[PDB]
Write a protein that binds this DNA or RNA. Structure first.
Ligand SMILES: [Zn+2]
Lengths: 98, 144, 346, 243, 49, 48, 96
DNA sequence: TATAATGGGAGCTGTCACGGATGCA
DNA sequence: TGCATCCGTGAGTGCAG
């Protein structure tokens, strides 16, 4: 929850925050491939009573040596009005940082 | 043993075939839906290698105790995927073809080896003129 | 020098047919096929196996290759052999070996004669993924079709009938080898549908249409979702060597990470796991850390449900499932001291 | 002639006169190399020194082949080799879009011609057609290997960009030798602005501690354990990943 | 200049469909495919030097 | 307006050609939402 | 490049520099463990984190690319030991 | 699968200097 | 034989891009 304290319910940083290297600006999830857990890994979780999760942390963090104060966010989905993006993209999010 | 020299020399057609693992029959890359490689094409794994380590194409054999078995269903070896980097294929030509280096690297290496002019080797190669191997007695304009 | 003016010149050598020479050659080709299965049911060999032999001898031994579909390998020994129980026939039966031979010979002069026509069709299928010559050859390829299917008795000129197979064969090539990702000829066909209908929509609206403005005018069974995922497979790939910048010292491919091969962090992260878990089997028991080291794999994995578990563990079937729980149990207490495992869940 | 019941004979010979690499693979194949050496030194004895000169150049090619054991005909290919697919990949970039080497389109280009030639043969085609197919086949192979070298260079549709032939890959300032073999990019390295430190001793410099941390990230990870600022190396790393 | 090059391509494609498809039931509308123009402009503005 | 070389056909439509990019007041362009500039080019001039 | 999390190009002229000094091992490192000797590269970043000296290196994976690219031009490049018999720098992965 | 149709289309420009291989009085 | 004349091959580094 520390690593999330500055994100709204959707996964966007809150306008007016302080973001530094490592910080998630936008949480994103993506599905795991034909490397869905191997033996070494299925077993390791068999110990921890937490079974293989099927999504992944693909979030957008901040690169080394950058950071600032979230000033703004644009969220373009499709299914919303006005908007339609290159084929195969559901939604795009831009976050400007000062 | 310890590398100490590096030899470079010509590839006999037999040798080229000695390298090969597959005749690339179809000019197909990967399936427009499966996004997997089409068989007999430039990325077919039954030729070149397992795309994912120690895992055959269809799903038959899927780890290291099988190693080297070419599964029956799909025909792919069970090895490291690193082989898609090293395993040569070959394209068997119907009529043979000139390695342009030995053609056009002036002075031609084939063209000097046969007292063939530059512009002869072109004509004979890019089909501007015939070249007789056995005139079987022909004669042209009063001269054999 | 220029490989098109070249071919445009060889073609310009074979004269154009006239109406009689048209019907002459066409006629001889028809009769020669008839001749070939009359010639087949006399000797009983095979029309095609027989046809190739007529074919060889007319063109010269210059060409012969074991024809796919024929059952024997058509080497110059079987062409003399078989040309022999051919010329062995009575003058009224071996009458037809001269008919075939004449046919094959007219086949050629009729193809060769009408190559200028192909040119004048492929000329206008340019800029579609295939080069002029590539198109010509495909065009030609169909032309061959046209002669083995012509019926001179319908009185039509040859131009007319062939202009069908010609474009029929360009269009199959433009649609079967153009894309780096080969897509069935019919999907290609419907794709072009979207293009042409989208175009009129734009010519109508004054702006490019949305997905849904397409799914409508595309009719029923067409929704916005289905126009979209049709477009993304329609999507042609791009060159790793595409130029990045107005100089030429960077390739678009150079900015592309190699996700496949493991990184050195990962490479190392795996080796330290697969032994600091071997550093938790030989810590409490190594034969209960071996029956559940065989309920999965140290390499290859070994895990089904109930069946080889029941074959060779030493123990009974649902007793290995109990030291499965206690092997795990012990590790869950084992791993409250050597707590060097949590990190590996990321 | 069955209408005229004459047997015609047209004045014409059974000559063997070919075109293409088919010919040359044969003429090459018929070279007794020791023979030719004999003749050439046997003419290295001539005056006028321009015949003596060319007999050298030629003889140097002969004795080249003699001393190596290469067969001249091997400068002709029946079996064109194909380069492992990973060295010429097809990859999905971020947007699920695809990125591919030029070579695939140069092979593809070739395998279409070899294939419709194997077909144009069996379906018995006139020479004029078979001719255009073999020529086109050479130009295919002449572009896989050294595109641009002879005649027009093979461009993909919708641009004027030569495709990148195997020799293009091998050679030039951006070739494989000069850009990846005689010097690569490297790990454990950084860049920054420099700034004079007059306080430094002759053997020293001023390294920003953040550059230091990364450049030594392995070493720091270990020491971080050999003291205890983290339990193990993998958790140590996750500390330094958010500032 | 780039515009004189789209117009040029567009005319290669009209006469093409002038001498094939139906010489009397035709319009300006369907004898013109704009895209060759579109892409010549787009080109000059997105990848010119 | 299309006209037939032989009969006198007359059709007349106004066909949409696409969009031309406009120049802002300060004399620049927005192309895929990114201001850009079209640098004049110097070259030898037509003549003999 | 910074945005890719680059490495720094150690080009021809830098190599010369190391060459002139006679820093053989430091050069070899830049040519194998630090760039593309995937074995000894992965092998090193385990040795550091484990506190052991770095492994002597194997062949740069980029030389292999060179071999296979010359094969694809019908050219047979062969690593040879001193008694002139080949050396498989693919550890049997290309043999049959 | 059948009126008839029978030889392309775009060049691209303002470098230079050397070395080699070829043509020609 | 000696000398035009054409064709092919070169033309700095790293970084931002
Ligand atoms: Zn399988």
């Amino acid at each position: 929850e520390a690593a999330l304290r500055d994100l709204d319910e959707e996964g966007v940083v809150r306008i007016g925050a302080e973001v530094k290297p490592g910080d998630i600006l936008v949480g994103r999830t993506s599905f795991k491939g034909e490397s869905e857990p191997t033996p070494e890994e299925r077993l390791l979780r068999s110990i921890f009573g937490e079974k293989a999760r099927d999504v992944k942390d693909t979030s957008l963090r901040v690169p080394p040596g950058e950071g600032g104060i979230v000033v703004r966010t644009v969220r373009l989905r499709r299914g919303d009005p006005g908007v339609e993006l290159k084929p195969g993209v559901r939604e795009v999010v831009r976050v400007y940082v000062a | 043993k310890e590398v100490r020299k590096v030899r470079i020399a010509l590839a006999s057609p037999e040798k080229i075939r000695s390298w090969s693992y597959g005749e690339v029959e179809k000019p197909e890359t990967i399936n427009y839906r499966t996004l997997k490689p089409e068989r007999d094409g430039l990325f077919d794994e039954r030729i070149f290698g397992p795309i994912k380590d120690y895992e055959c194409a269809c799903g038959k054999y899927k780890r290291q105790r099988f190693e080297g078995k070419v599964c029956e269903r799909c025909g792919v070896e069970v090895t490291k995927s690193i082989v898609k980097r090293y395993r040569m294929g070959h394209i068997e030509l119907a009529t043979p073809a000139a390695h342009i280096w030995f053609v056009k690297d002036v002075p031609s290496k084939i063209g000097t080896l046969l007292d063939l002019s530059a512009t002869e080797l072109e004509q004979v190669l890019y089909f501007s003129k015939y070249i007789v191997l056995d005139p079987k007695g022909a004669i042209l304009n009063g001269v054999p | 020098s220029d490989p098109v003016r070249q071919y445009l010149h060889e073609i310009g050598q074979v004269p154009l047919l006239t109406l009689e020479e048209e019907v002459e050659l066409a006629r001889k080709v028809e009769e020669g096929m008839e001749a070939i299965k009359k010639l087949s049911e006399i000797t009983g060999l095979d029309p095609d196996l027989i046809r190739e032999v007529v074919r060889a001898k007319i063109l010269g031994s210059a060409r012969v290759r074991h024809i796919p579909g024929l059952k024997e390998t058509l080497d110059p020994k079987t062409v003399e052999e078989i040309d022999q129980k051919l010329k062995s026939l009575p003058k009224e039966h071996k009458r037809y070996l001269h008919i075939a031979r004449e046919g094959e010979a007219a086949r050629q002069h009729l193809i060769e004669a009408n190559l200028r026509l192909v040119v004048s069709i492929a000329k206008k299928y340019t800029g579609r993924g295939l080069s002029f010559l590539d198109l010509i050859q495909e065009g030609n390829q169909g032309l061959i079709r046209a002669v083995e299917k012509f019926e001179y008795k319908r009185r039509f000129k040859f131009s007319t009938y062939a202009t069908w197979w010609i474009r029929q064969a360009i269009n199959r090539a433009i649609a079967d080898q153009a894309r780096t990702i080969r897509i069935p000829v019919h999907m290609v066909e419907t794709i072009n549908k979207l293009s042409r209908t989208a175009r009129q929509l734009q010519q109508e609206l004054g702006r490019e249409p949305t997905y849904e403005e397409i799914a409508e005018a595309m009719g029923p069974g067409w929704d916005a979702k289905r126009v979209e995922e049709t477009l993304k497979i329609a999507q042609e790939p791009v060159s790793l060597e595409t130029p990045i910048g107005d100089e030429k010292d960077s390739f678009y491919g150079d900015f592309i990470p190699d996700e496949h091969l493991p990184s050195p962090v990962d490479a190392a992260t795996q080796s330290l796991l697969s032994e600091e878990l071997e550093k938790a089997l030989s810590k409490l028991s190594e034969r209960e850390a071996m029956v559940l080291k065989l309920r999965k794999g140290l390499i290859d994995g070994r895990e089904h449900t109930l069946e080889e578990v029941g074959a060779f563990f030493g123990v009974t079937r649902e007793r290995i499932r109990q030291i499965e729980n206690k092997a795990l149990r012990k590790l869950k207490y084992h791993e409250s001291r050597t707590r060097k495992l949590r990190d590996f869940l990321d | 002639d069955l209408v005229r019941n004459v047997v015609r004979v047209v004045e014409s010979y059974d000559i063997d006169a070919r075109m293409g690499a088919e010919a040359i693979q044969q003429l090459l194949k018929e070279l007794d190399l020791e023979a030719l050496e004999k003749e050439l030194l046997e003419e290295m004895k001539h005056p006028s020194r321009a015949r003596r000169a060319k007999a050298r150049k030629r003889l140097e090619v002969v004795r080249a082949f003699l001393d190596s054991g290469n067969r001249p005909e091997w400068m002709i290919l029946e079996a064109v080799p194909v380069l492992p697919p990973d060295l010429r990949p097809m990859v999905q970039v971020d947007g699920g879009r695809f990125a591919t080497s030029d070579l695939n389109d140069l092979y593809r280009r070739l395998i279409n011609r070899n294939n419709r030639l194997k077909k144009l043969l069996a379906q018995g085609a006139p020479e004029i057609i078979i001719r255009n197919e073999k020529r086109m086949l050479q130009e295919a192979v002449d572009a896989l290997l050294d595109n641009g070298r002879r005649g027009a260079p093979v461009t993909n549709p919708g641009s004027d960009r030569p495709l990148r032939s195997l020799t293009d890959i091998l050679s030039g300032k951006q070739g494989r030798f000069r850009q990846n073999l005689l010097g690569k990019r490297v790990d454990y390295s950084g860049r920054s602005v420099i700034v004079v430190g007059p306080q430094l001793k002759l053997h020293q410099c001023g390294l920003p501690k953040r550059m230091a941390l990364e450049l030594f990230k392995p070493f720091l990870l270990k020491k971080m354990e050999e003291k205890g600022i983290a339990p193990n190396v993998k958790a140590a790393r996750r500390m330094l990943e958010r500032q | 200049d780039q515009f004189r090059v789209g117009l040029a391509r567009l005319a290669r494609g009209v006469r093409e469909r002038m001498l094939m498809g139906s010489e009397d039931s035709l319009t300006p509308a369907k004898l013109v495919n704009s895209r060759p123009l579109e892409a010549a402009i787009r080109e000059f503005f997105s990848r010119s030097q | 307006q299309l006209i037939h070389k032989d009969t006198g056909l007359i059709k007349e439509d106004e066909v949409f050609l696409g969009h031309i990019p406009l120049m802002t007041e300060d004399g620049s362009f927005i192309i895929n939402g990114a201001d850009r500039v079209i640098v004049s080019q110097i070259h030898r001039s037509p003549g003999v | 490049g910074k945005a890719q999390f680059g490495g720094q190009r150690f080009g021809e002229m830098e190599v010369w520099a190391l060459e002139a000094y006679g820093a053989a091992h430091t050069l070899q490192e830049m040519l194998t463990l630090k760039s593309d000797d995937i074995e000894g590269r992965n092998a090193a970043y385990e040795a550091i984190i484990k506190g052991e000296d770095v492994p002597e290196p194997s062949v740069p994976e980029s030389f292999r690319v060179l071999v296979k690219e010359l094969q694809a031009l019908a050219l047979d490049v062969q690593t040879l030991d001193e008694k002139d018999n080949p050396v498989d720098i693919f550890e049997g992965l290309a043999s049959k």
